[PDB]
Structure 1
Amino acid sequence: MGIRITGTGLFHPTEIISNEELADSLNAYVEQYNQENAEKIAAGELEELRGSSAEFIEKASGIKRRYVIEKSGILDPTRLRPRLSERSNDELSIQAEWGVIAAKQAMENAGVTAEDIDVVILACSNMQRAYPAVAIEIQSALGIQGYAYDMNVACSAATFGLKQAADAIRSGARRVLLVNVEITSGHLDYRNRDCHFIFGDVATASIIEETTTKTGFEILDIHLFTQFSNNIRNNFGFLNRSEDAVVDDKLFRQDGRKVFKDVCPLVAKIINAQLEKMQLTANDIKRFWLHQANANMNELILKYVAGKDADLSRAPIILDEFANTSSAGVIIALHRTGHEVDDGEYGVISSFGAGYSVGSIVVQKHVA
């Protein structure tokens, strides 16, 4: 009791890549590859590459576009990664800069200032460097005094981060700033038709406070769950240098079919057990804020936990515009539609994905 999400913030870069631009770009790479390797095709030595299309992407996921940090290099079929420049230690890192922008909006929405915050958690799927923690970089750019740390549970990092925020509040923290900064274009493989469309870039932030007198979503129950799986994995890391690594697996890899099979029943089972635990039915939940990877997966999970005739409207979809933003997804959804929940009504925040990880939070809105 007494712990509320009182504000959220959102930043996305300016440039947009539509499905068609992305498909056009990969088609060119696949075409050139299949020419250059034609004799290797006819020989069965190397595997031929298959193009993609806007319809195949949208039908597979519900994604239509995504925001990206830098558009040219991603679409450039001879580059297939954003065109970025190294920054000097004296300027904000990219990740710290995005985090600060999202975080200032969360703070302004919650009506708090730097001196009001005690903890800064950077919770996301990939940190730009190991030390000093980018969370501490964000913390000091904002002028916040307390402590900060980086934390990684991939797609579920925001719901784990909310639990850790609530845990620190129970122990004495007044207010926690939770920040998720996902520059997925830095570790996505744009050569692969099966994953090149999945992810977008974004930063989100949340202010979590101990309060009974500010409007916000009070956290009622948290279920976190992990179970190791290699069905989503990125083997890039600081030991690749010492391994003299050669395997081409240093970016996002996924068996999408197995993830879909494994995670849908996992999420629904966790949500249902949580609702039972809380003496609530699915029809007491005004909004399900679900992970934003795949609208079919969401509709599936939604129709199990709720009725088959539940209104589309109760599980907001933002992935059409952002693609999958990994840990940031549920926060985007909450940021865009929390206003659709009435005073006293209930909501569910649930992330799921890599690691296998699942986090599920029951909340109830209070208006001050």
Structure 2
Amino acid sequence: TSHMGIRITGTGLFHPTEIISNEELADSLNAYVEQYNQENAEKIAAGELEELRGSSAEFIEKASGIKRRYVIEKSGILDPTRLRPRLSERSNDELSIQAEWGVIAAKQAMENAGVTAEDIDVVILACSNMQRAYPAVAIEIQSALGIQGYAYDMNVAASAATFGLKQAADAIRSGARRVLLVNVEITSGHLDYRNRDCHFIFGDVATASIIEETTTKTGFEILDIHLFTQFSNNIRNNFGFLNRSEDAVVDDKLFRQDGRKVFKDVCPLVAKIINAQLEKMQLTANDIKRFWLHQANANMNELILKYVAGKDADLSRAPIILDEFANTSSAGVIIALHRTGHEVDDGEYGVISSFGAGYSVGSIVVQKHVA
């Protein structure tokens, strides 16, 4: 009863068209590993450097549940002479790529919510990486849509959507009418496509949500929010604007992870959060029609789902979209909600729970209202 009338009333989804199957990608890494492992063969049999392993489509799917992923530009990523998208600098007078994707997803969420630019007071860009420091990309999006009010960029990586939803609900509580929350994840821009353990994890996407105070629109009423962060170096990327002054050389300016430590750390934390949240609301797990969990690893989600809802929880109650999208970082829970929110009936309960880098966890109990 903290957010009476505050509802997610529309979502929108954009992905780039080109697709990389697990096989195209595992092949690409394999080529690069075969040429690196023989270019440096004199030093491989010398204890000095490195021994590179490849991978296969079946190794990816069993570690993750991922099958394919959308990407901004497929040639450069798959090319073993490059291993990164082939993009072109845009002039200042055109929409940046991040603004461009955000606008596409935003127009869809606005149409789904039945609102236009004049109805929106706040724009939040919340994702794991921003294309530039200033002017804020959220302000670029606000201006492209013709929105008046104010906008800002916000980063807490994997949990940026749930943290942003709280910030949206807070701004509405204090007087905002409606908030546009945008998540643009171009993860192919900071993915290390050379590493077998992480090159498959992420895909590209833009999501958007409309949050409004309303007693007359269909949407998900926000009932309770628990945000949590606890510093961890087990996921980290050291690229930044001070690298040039550091004359940096350490090859750690991309995604890096100790996935085993993350697995062991994150699943118990998330399950503890959700269960304490359910007890606080006096809901049982059986009262929850849908768990929209972070969309990174089906093996994590299955563990959490069993910890929270029981070994016999039906799989339809925890929709998986990472099979199609791979990990879209902050946008994951929103994709899942965008695809399956229609599966929740009026009066029924759902839980949105992000978790990942920073160690950040964000968990939101919602209830559907159909008008």
State the SS of the aligned residue for 1:358. Answer: strand
Q: Does 1:115 align with 2:118?
A: yes
Q: CA shift at 1:134, angstroms? A: 0.1
CA distance in structure 2 between the partners assigned to 1:30 and 1:174 by the alignment: 53
1:60-94 deviation digits (Å, cap 9, x = unpaired):
00000000000000000010000000000000000
Q: CA shift at 1:337, angstroms? A: 0.2
CA distance in structure 1 between the partners assigned to 2:339 and 2:51 by the alignment: 42
Q: CA shift at 1:57, angstroms? A: 0.2
Q: CA shift at 1:190, angstroms? A: 0.1
CA distance in structure 2 between the partners assigned to 1:96 and 1:268 by the alignment: 35
Q: CA shift at 1:239, angstroms? A: 0.1
1:278-320 deviation digits (Å, cap 9, x = unpaired):
0100000000000000000000000000011010110000000
Q: CA shift at 1:240, angstroms? A: 0.1
CA distance in structure 1 between the partners assigned to 2:23 and 2:334 by the alignment: 27
Give runs of ≥4 in structure 1 deviating > 6 Å: none
1:21-52 deviation digits (Å, cap 9, x = unpaired):
00000000000000001111100100110000
State the SS of the aligned residue for 1:7. Answer: strand
CA distance in structure 2 between the partners assigned to 1:222 and 1:126 by the alignment: 24
Residues paired across the two proteins, number: 368
Which residue of structure 1 lines up, in the alignment, with residue 220 of structure 2?
217
State the SS of the aligned residue for 1:98. Answer: helix
State the SS of the aligned residue for 1:218. Answer: strand
Unaligned runs of 5+ in 2: none
CA distance in structure 1 between the partners assigned to 2:311 and 2:28 by the alignment: 39
State the SS of the aligned residue for 1:222. Answer: strand
Q: CA shift at 1:199, angstroms? A: 0.0
- After TM superposition, the score normalised by the length of structure 2 is 0.99
CA distance in structure 2 between the partners assigned to 1:343 and 1:174 by the alignment: 23
State the SS of the aligned residue for 1:148. Answer: strand
Which residue of structure 1 lines up, in the alignment, with residue 168 of structure 2?
165
CA distance in structure 2 between the partners assigned to 1:31 and 1:65 by the alignment: 23
CA distance in structure 2 between the partners assigned to 1:78 and 1:189 by the alignment: 14
Q: CA shift at 1:326, angstroms? A: 0.1
- After TM superposition, the score normalised by the length of structure 1 is 1.00
State the SS of the aligned residue for 1:361. Answer: strand
User: Which of 159, 170, 182 is the aligned partner of 1:156?
Assistant: 159
Which residue of structure 2 lines up, in the alignment, with residue 236 of structure 1?
239
Q: CA shift at 1:257, angstroms? A: 0.3
Q: CA shift at 1:248, angstroms? A: 0.1
CA distance in structure 2 between the partners assigned to 1:342 and 1:44 by the alignment: 61
CA distance in structure 2 between the partners assigned to 1:285 and 1:348 by the alignment: 7
CA distance in structure 2 between the partners assigned to 1:354 and 1:256 by the alignment: 11
Q: CA shift at 1:144, angstroms? A: 0.2
Q: CA shift at 1:146, angstroms? A: 0.3
State the SS of the aligned residue for 1:176. Answer: strand
Unaligned runs of 5+ in 1: none
1:226-279 deviation digits (Å, cap 9, x = unpaired):
000000000000000000000000000000000000000000000000000001
| Superposed CA RMSD | 0.3
CA distance in structure 2 between the partners assigned to 1:161 and 1:28 by the alignment: 40
CA distance in structure 1 between the partners assigned to 2:107 and 2:65 by the alignment: 30
CA distance in structure 2 between the partners assigned to 1:132 and 1:171 by the alignment: 26
CA distance in structure 2 between the partners assigned to 1:44 and 1:8 by the alignment: 53
User: Which of 280, 285, 295 is the aligned partner of 1:282?
Assistant: 285
CA distance in structure 1 between the partners assigned to 2:269 and 2:71 by the alignment: 31
CA distance in structure 2 between the partners assigned to 1:111 and 1:44 by the alignment: 63
Percent identical pairs in the alignment equals 100
State the SS of the aligned residue for 2:29. Answer: helix
